[PDB]
Ligand binder design. Sequence first.
Ligand SMILES: *[C@@H]1O[C@H](CO)[C@@H](O[C@@H]2O[C@H](CO)[C@@H](O[C@H]3O[C@H](CO)[C@@H](O)[C@H](O)[C@@H]3O)[C@H](O)[C@H]2NC(C)=O)[C@H](O)[C@H]1NC(C)=O
Ligand SMILES: *[C@@H]1O[C@H](CO)[C@@H](O[C@@H]2O[C@H](CO)[C@@H](O[C@H]3O[C@H](CO)[C@@H](O)[C@H](O)[C@@H]3O)[C@H](O)[C@H]2NC(C)=O)[C@H](O)[C@H]1NC(C)=O
Ligand SMILES: *[C@@H]1O[C@H](CO)[C@@H](O[C@@H]2O[C@H](CO)[C@@H](O[C@H]3O[C@H](CO)[C@@H](O)[C@H](O)[C@@H]3O)[C@H](O)[C@H]2NC(C)=O)[C@H](O)[C@H]1NC(C)=O
Ligand SMILES: *[C@@H]1O[C@H](CO)[C@@H](O[C@@H]2O[C@H](CO)[C@@H](O[C@H]3O[C@H](CO)[C@@H](O)[C@H](O)[C@@H]3O)[C@H](O)[C@H]2NC(C)=O)[C@H](O)[C@H]1NC(C)=O
Ligand SMILES: *[C@@H]1O[C@H](CO)[C@@H](O[C@@H]2O[C@H](CO)[C@@H](O[C@H]3O[C@H](CO)[C@@H](O)[C@H](O)[C@@H]3O)[C@H](O)[C@H]2NC(C)=O)[C@H](O)[C@H]1NC(C)=O
Ligand SMILES: *[C@@H]1O[C@H](CO[C@@H]2O[C@@H](C)[C@@H](O)[C@@H](O)[C@@H]2O)[C@@H](O[C@@H]2O[C@H](CO)[C@@H](O)[C@H](O)[C@H]2NC(C)=O)[C@H](O)[C@H]1NC(C)=O
Ligand SMILES: *[C@@H]1O[C@H](CO)[C@@H](O)[C@H](O)[C@H]1NC(C)=O
Ligand SMILES: *[C@@H]1O[C@H](CO)[C@@H](O)[C@H](O)[C@H]1NC(C)=O
Ligand SMILES: *[C@@H]1O[C@H](CO)[C@@H](O)[C@H](O)[C@H]1NC(C)=O
Ligand SMILES: *[C@@H]1O[C@H](CO)[C@@H](O)[C@H](O)[C@H]1NC(C)=O
Lengths: 41, 328, 237, 43
Amino acid sequence: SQSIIAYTMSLGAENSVAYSNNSIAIPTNFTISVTTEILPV
Amino acid sequence: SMTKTSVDCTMYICGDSTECSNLLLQYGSFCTQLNRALTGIAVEQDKNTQEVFAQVKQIYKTPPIKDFGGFNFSQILPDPSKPSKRSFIEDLLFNKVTLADAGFIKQDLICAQKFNGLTVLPPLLTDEMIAQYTSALLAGTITSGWTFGAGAALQIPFAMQMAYRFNGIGVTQNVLYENQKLIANQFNSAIGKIQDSLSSTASALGKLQNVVNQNAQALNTLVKQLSSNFGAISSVLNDILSRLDKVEAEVQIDRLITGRLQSLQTYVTQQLIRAAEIRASANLAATKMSECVLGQSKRVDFCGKGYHLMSFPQSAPHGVVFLHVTYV
Amino acid sequence: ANQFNSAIGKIQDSLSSTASALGKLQNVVNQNAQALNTLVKQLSSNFGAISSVLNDILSRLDKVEAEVQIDRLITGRLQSLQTYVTQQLIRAAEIRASANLAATKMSECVLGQSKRVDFCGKGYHLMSFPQSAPHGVVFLHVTYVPAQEKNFTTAPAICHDGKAHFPREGVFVSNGTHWFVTQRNFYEPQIITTDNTFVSGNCDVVIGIVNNTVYDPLQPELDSFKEELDKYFKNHT
Amino acid sequence: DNTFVSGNCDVVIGIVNNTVYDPLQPELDSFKEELDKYFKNHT
Ligand SMILES: *[C@@H]1O[C@H](CO)[C@@H](O[C@@H]2O[C@H](CO)[C@@H](O[C@H]3O[C@H](CO)[C@@H](O)[C@H](O)[C@@H]3O)[C@H](O)[C@H]2NC(C)=O)[C@H](O)[C@H]1NC(C)=O
Ligand SMILES: *[C@@H]1O[C@H](CO)[C@@H](O[C@@H]2O[C@H](CO)[C@@H](O[C@H]3O[C@H](CO)[C@@H](O)[C@H](O)[C@@H]3O)[C@H](O)[C@H]2NC(C)=O)[C@H](O)[C@H]1NC(C)=O
Ligand SMILES: *[C@@H]1O[C@H](CO)[C@@H](O[C@@H]2O[C@H](CO)[C@@H](O[C@H]3O[C@H](CO)[C@@H](O)[C@H](O)[C@@H]3O)[C@H](O)[C@H]2NC(C)=O)[C@H](O)[C@H]1NC(C)=O
Ligand SMILES: *[C@@H]1O[C@H](CO)[C@@H](O[C@@H]2O[C@H](CO)[C@@H](O[C@H]3O[C@H](CO)[C@@H](O)[C@H](O)[C@@H]3O)[C@H](O)[C@H]2NC(C)=O)[C@H](O)[C@H]1NC(C)=O
Ligand SMILES: *[C@@H]1O[C@H](CO)[C@@H](O[C@@H]2O[C@H](CO)[C@@H](O[C@H]3O[C@H](CO)[C@@H](O)[C@H](O)[C@@H]3O)[C@H](O)[C@H]2NC(C)=O)[C@H](O)[C@H]1NC(C)=O
Ligand SMILES: *[C@@H]1O[C@H](CO[C@@H]2O[C@@H](C)[C@@H](O)[C@@H](O)[C@@H]2O)[C@@H](O[C@@H]2O[C@H](CO)[C@@H](O)[C@H](O)[C@H]2NC(C)=O)[C@H](O)[C@H]1NC(C)=O
Ligand SMILES: *[C@@H]1O[C@H](CO)[C@@H](O)[C@H](O)[C@H]1NC(C)=O
Ligand SMILES: *[C@@H]1O[C@H](CO)[C@@H](O)[C@H](O)[C@H]1NC(C)=O
Ligand SMILES: *[C@@H]1O[C@H](CO)[C@@H](O)[C@H](O)[C@H]1NC(C)=O
Ligand SMILES: *[C@@H]1O[C@H](CO)[C@@H](O)[C@H](O)[C@H]1NC(C)=O
């Protein structure tokens, strides 16, 4: 059932930011994340 | 970025002759090596456009209620009336740069170039997609400040974000709230002066027009070298083959092959050296996207002549414009 | 510490699982090998000489004919080196850019902490650890990422006693019924006080100011001392 | 003035016991000895 598809790419997930003139979002918690980055030297 | 170009080294050197193509094979992998180099440049133009614009994994959108505390972004935000969602200031930039050969279906200078085996490839990201990424970066800025760069987009009122900015330049946040109606009028008037400037002068986009001009000039120089004899009795391959039998024709055709091949090796060398300049400029533009749009920079004169508050990206043909907002 | 230890665990799992993670280094090794192979393959080419093998030309022809064939091999061969060295000079400029970037990330992410957004990984930068790799460097960037947000109602200022108050550091928030200062990057609410805030101007000029009490930590000291003062008078009657 | 407070002592690994000076307190007490001298004279 596998085949090659072709499609217009999506740029990302859709996301409305819930803006209002007196609303703020503040993080109650955090994640410490470790991410590799690789450079030719 | 710059225009993606590829060349059929056989159609350029030997265009539609079998008896020239058998001599071109005696030069080994040189045609493949040129094709590779031009492909490496062409893939790098998407790498660059992706590193500059695709700095968000979510496409944010501005709310329907534009209560930004008196600041007026309607000349840098999208315009739903236009058949692409380009903003008012971006659709000035798309008029100022006078493009050439976008490779969108052929069916003139452009027709002369293509008919000699010089094809121009599409970019991966069309001008709608760059406008959407630019809209998302701007919507993240005017609703969430820097935080959509660091992690989740966290809403904040725009006047309170401007206060956090002011604190970032050692001006106490009450200096914003006590002057907010003035600070908004100054910002709105300064955005007005950008539209007037771009409507008035042609030279403002010279850094982008020079890239489009060098791509066109380098393609034209490579077409003009089809006119040259290189010491053969004619510059036209079919005439040599019409007038001479095989053992004399091979001596003339080899002069055209040798001269043409040097003409491609020159073009591909110039284009590799331009690709490294555009490559640098794209790494700078990606760094200004990350440090001036997704953040606020303490780096003096990196995000405009002043103390940096925030910057807004705008797409341009083969480029990016930053509207840097600075406290002076 | 448990989050850091688990995130370092995920790096070992990632590197054990995928091949494509080191593509930026394998592409350099591949281009060096491909450029060397292309330069060897151009020894096979005739360039229009009666053979690509130099000894055959010299075996079959005497000097004045051999010179005409050998010059075609020399000319083609030279152009093959001038091509290789040009490609390698242009690659050397790319690797040198990348090395100047890696040296800058060593200085600003390992020897320091960077305020440069997204320079030392996707997050707020804490620290980075260098690791060597064949022809390269890996940085393990450690970043604080804010994780579980709540909405709050907010205000630019509090109006207490004809005067407008602003946070010294942090932001004002309310859960709906009560108002607090919190630091901007982690929810830790504190009672609004003359220690948490500073004053500027009357309440009339700030768009969106809200009325709330502003605590003074000198006042219940002064009043608990006023009830001690009253007890001294009342006993001494 | 040099420090700020958060939580009780139980959660911080490696906390140490030491006095924490309050510069309001010897003012309030030097004022309590002025206050006592006013009472003691007015006896
Ligand atoms: C902040 O986010 C932390 C995760 O990054 C979170 O830690 C997690 O806490 C929950 C409990 O609240 C743990 O869930 C497990 O709890 C016990 C076993 O210990 C079981 O009864 C449950 O079924 C479940 O398995 C998570 O395992 C734990 N994760 C880690 C890495 O410690 C914090 O609790 C969050 N803190 C706040 C204040 O929101
Ligand atoms: C945000 O800034 C916008 C750009 O200045 C502004 O749009 C402008 O609005 C005025 C007022 O309507 C327009 O002025 C024209 O209005 C009608 C047009 O038919 C005429 O009767 C008037 O004589 C006058 O020509 C501007 O033309 C218009 N500009 C654009 C580009 O649309 C918004 O109104 C501002 N928004 C807020 C909330 O302040
Ligand atoms: C907004 O945050 C407020 C502070 O946390 C919170 O008010 C506090 O609510 C608790 C109960 O959850 C009260 O606790 C007292 O409740 C009775 C009082 O007679 C006693 O049984 C308890 O021992 C205790 O004394 C706090 O006193 C109260 N704090 C204040 C300053 O009033 C609100 O409930 C939160 N509002 C929302 C909408 O979540
Ligand atoms: C925040 O707190 C302020 C102080 O309590 C409050 O100001 C007060 O507002 C009322 C209503 O406007 C005024 O009431 C008087 O208004 C006029 C005379 O000025 C008369 O017509 C009325 O009958 C009535 O006497 C108070 O005088 C006024 N006080 C001060 C010092 O300004 C704000 O309205 C509060 N705002 C919010 C959003 O809570
Ligand atoms: C830092 O100062 C703390 C306050 O003085 C001190 O806590 C005190 O520790 C002792 C010894 O554990 C406790 O003594 C009592 O312990 C149990 C009952 O809880 C009884 O079996 C004992 O006989 C004795 O009565 C104190 O009650 C305890 N006080 C408090 C408020 O916790 C810390 O131990 C000191 N730590 C250091 C490192 O100096
Ligand atoms: C923060 O709140 C927004 C919406 O505002 C709230 O709307 C009321 C229902 C009430 O909760 C008020 O206190 C607020 O004013 C949230 O956005 C909504 O998210 C849900 C999915 O979770 C979605 O179905 C809705 O359509 C969204 N509405 C809008 C206008 O965007 C937002 O998710 C809240 N933040 C968090 C962390 O939950
Ligand atoms: C916020 O917006 C509402 C309308 O949604 C308006 O009534 C209110 O006055 C605004 N407040 C501020 C401080 O701008
Ligand atoms: C009341 O005053 C007397 C001196 O007249 C003093 O000895 C006593 O300790 C005082 N008691 C209290 C509760 O103040
Ligand atoms: C520090 O290390 C010693 C052992 O050398 C240990 O006894 C002590 O509990 C440790 N203290 C802290 C705060 O980690
Ligand atoms: C003592 O009280 C009297 C008033 O009764 C006053 O004149 C005098 O200055 C006071 N002296 C001291 C030392 O308080």
